[PDB]
Design a binder for this molecule. Structure first.
Ligand SMILES: CN(C(=O)CC[C@@H](C1CCCCC1)N1Cc2cc(Oc3ccccc3)ccc2N=C1N)C1CCCCC1
Ligand SMILES: CN(C(=O)CC[C@@H](C1CCCCC1)N1Cc2cc(Oc3ccccc3)ccc2N=C1N)C1CCCCC1
Lengths: 385, 385
């Protein structure tokens, strides 16, 4: 029913079909756990397949307020309204929610992409222009008996997605209100959401094919550590990045490659038949557990951090980006982490659960894993203030 | 002659008119000291006014090599060639240089912008795909008697630039081969380029309306510190950023404003007639001088770090971005720093000189300044490895 309701790209994000207004207008909306606004294209920007036409809806109501969201040299800007929203491949209910009608933008929409708005599933406190603008999911829970949780299985699997292989090779599932046991194996292990703004969690130890990085663990969460479906890469604060980089470098001497590859300034390339996965180490993050002194680890492969970028001449040349990178925003657990796992955003219990995804990419030697319990101390002082 | 040869925006960069091929094709090219490729639009992307048509030029030569330049979720990609380049409002000479013909891109070109390529004036070692691709300015110096230096005066002044106020309100000067005394007052003070890759310099002390930040000075240059005409903001490593932020916050209590403003997640707004400049502190960077134990300081105002963003309803509401921000790439001295000064990229002597620009924005109370000499110790260990 809601299984397989997501399409598009690890690399251009995952989008769900929604309806807005009466009669219902269908749009593809990117699912974004790193933000808190529901915002849709409202004018004919050339890159968009479609856009919200308020004229055509009886339930539209103006809030007479504008909103302006700068990000990194780009922006979007819009006018705030409310209307009636549904999700065709979601729970059978209709909510009135805030909608930012996007009317100007730069470096927001992506040419070639097939989605036309964003669903921010994170918390009010990061809602623009301010926390009073009640986020969609809050609204969906206030106005119905749908339970206060959702889960995500991000796949992006078989062979490279495109624009009739973005439509017709559907890349994962959003289960609204629940958890489906068919989407994972073993058990869920749960880390507490440290605060309800982004989905902040505390990472307490990092390992690369076995080897601790013996750093203050305040530096794994420096500024913050977050789970974010709108981000493609595994992103790591400078010190941890440089440190991880060096030991990923060391673990990897088996074969060799250039400086700027590690910094995402050039991309990497070998023959097909001839991917060298073994010379790459597993990455392991330990996260804070539900109990004092107890952690669990999730473990990902290079399958998920060396992630195909769209071929030289769709040939047999294989070209990927190192999907780990730097940040001054904290640790960002994006699709590289998420496509390893079924992720349960248990908002009622203030926690995030992780299990091994039933669709994750692997082989026969290794695998993605979730394992505990482990004994780890001074865990909440891995945080930052 | 070359005075006033630059147009466009602090915010969409500065561009110079160039010609490529025979007969000569005119293009607007962004001047970028943070990169090392000469790269121009080569196909009809909708955002471009014009583009390089190799078909039309007899002197074009194919190098049969491609190049692919990922940056932050965006990219450009091109095919490498050489042709004959001139600069109409520059030294009267013609060079054969490398040209990357751009054939695919994402989040590179800007809609509304009026430039169509980039001139990278920095060093080979950061030339894509590799250092063997000889940068334009190297080529311009190998093939002529034009001296090995250029200087820049970035203004962006009177009233807000646009698209007939981007054309017709010309925002600064690039003097190729020389230095014009009419563009500055007082004297040039010179900091050594620590290494020829980017224009890396070492910052040795920071002050805010007088008050040191008493941090290790290894952290002002953490990763690196660079002078970059392609960047709009003053950008500062996390620790220095947070630390600068806090004392900019403290100096500024006089009046008050929100959390996310400081983080560029929302923008700031007051009445006209009613800009409150005084409640903002000067920023002072000390940089390494040409002599052991000796530094000099440059000093900028909020005029240059609180920088107008394009009006609510072109009204009297005044709305600006805090132009200082975070990085994991090092310190980046962009237009906020540069529009304060005439900047001399003295490549032959391996140094960068700074003087007070004759066009910089100020008032009657304060001013931008260049001052020395100062006594500062342990200066080269402010560097990083
Ligand atoms: C391409 N996208 C991103 O790169 C999102 C970056 C990501 C941040 C979240 C905080 C930690 C660092 C990574 N975000 C932030 C975000 C920003 C945003 O505002 C604009 C405005 C103009 C241009 C671009 C972004 C909107 C949504 C955000 N959600 C995040 N996960 C976007 C692509 C749109 C879909 C969201 C991700
Ligand atoms: C909008 N632009 C930038 O934001 C440039 C960022 C700036 C970096 C330099 C290193 C320190 C951190 C700031 N750069 C890097 C740079 C990257 C680049 O490659 C792409 C590829 C696709 C999309 C965007 C950029 C090309 C030139 C660069 N030069 C810098 N100063 C660009 C806008 C194009 C004009 C250059 C600045």
């Amino acid at each position: 029913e809601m299984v397989d309701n997501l399409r598009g790209k690890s690399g251009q994000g995952y989008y769900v079909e929604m309806t807005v207004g009466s009669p219902p207008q269908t749009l593809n909306i990117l699912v974004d756990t790193g933000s808190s606004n529901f915002a849709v294209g409202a004018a004919p920007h050339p890159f968009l397949h479609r856009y919200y036409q308020r004229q055509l809806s009886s339930t539209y109501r103006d809030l007479r307020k504008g909103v302006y969201v700068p990000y990194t040299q780009g922006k979007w800007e819009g006018e705030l309204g409310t209307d009636l929203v549904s999700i065709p491949h979601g729970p059978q209910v209709t909510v009135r929610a805030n909608i930012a009608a996007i009317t100007e933008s730069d470096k927001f929409f992506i040419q070639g992409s097939n989605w036309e708005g964003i669903l921010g599933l994170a918390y009010a406190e990061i809602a623009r222009p301010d926390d009073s603008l009640e986020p969609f999911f809050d609204s969906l829970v206030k106005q119905t008996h749908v339970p206060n949780l959702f889960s995500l299985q991000l796949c992006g699997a078989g062979f490279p997605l495109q624009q009739s292989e973005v439509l017709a090779s559907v890349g994962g599932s959003m289960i609204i209100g629940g958890i489906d046991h068919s989407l994972y194996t073993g058990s869920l292990w749960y880390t507490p959401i440290r605060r309800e703004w982004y989905y902040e969690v505390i990472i307490v130890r990092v390992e690369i094919n076995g080897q601790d990085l013996k750093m203050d663990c305040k530096e794994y969460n420096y500024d913050k550590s977050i789970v974010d479906s709108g981000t493609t890469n595994l992103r790591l604060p400078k010190k941890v990045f440089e440190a991880a980089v060096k030991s990923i470098k060391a673990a990897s001497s088996t074969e060799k490659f250039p400086d700027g590859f590690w910094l995402g300034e050039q991309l990497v390339c070998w023959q097909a038949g001839t991917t060298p996965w073994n010379i790459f180490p597993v990455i392991s993050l330990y996260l804070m557990g539900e109990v004092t002194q107890q952690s669990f680890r999730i473990t990902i492969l290079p399958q998920q951090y060396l992630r195909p970028v769209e071929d030289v001449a769709t040939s047999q040349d294989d070209c990927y980006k190192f999907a780990i990178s730097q940040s001054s925003t904290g640790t960002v657990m994006g699709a590289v982490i998420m496509e390893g796992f079924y992720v349960v955003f248990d908002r009622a219990r203030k926690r995030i659960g992780f299990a091994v995804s039933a669709c994750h990419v692997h082989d026969e030697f290794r695998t993605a894993a979730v394992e505990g319990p482990f004994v780890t101390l001074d865990m909440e002082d891995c945080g930052y203030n």
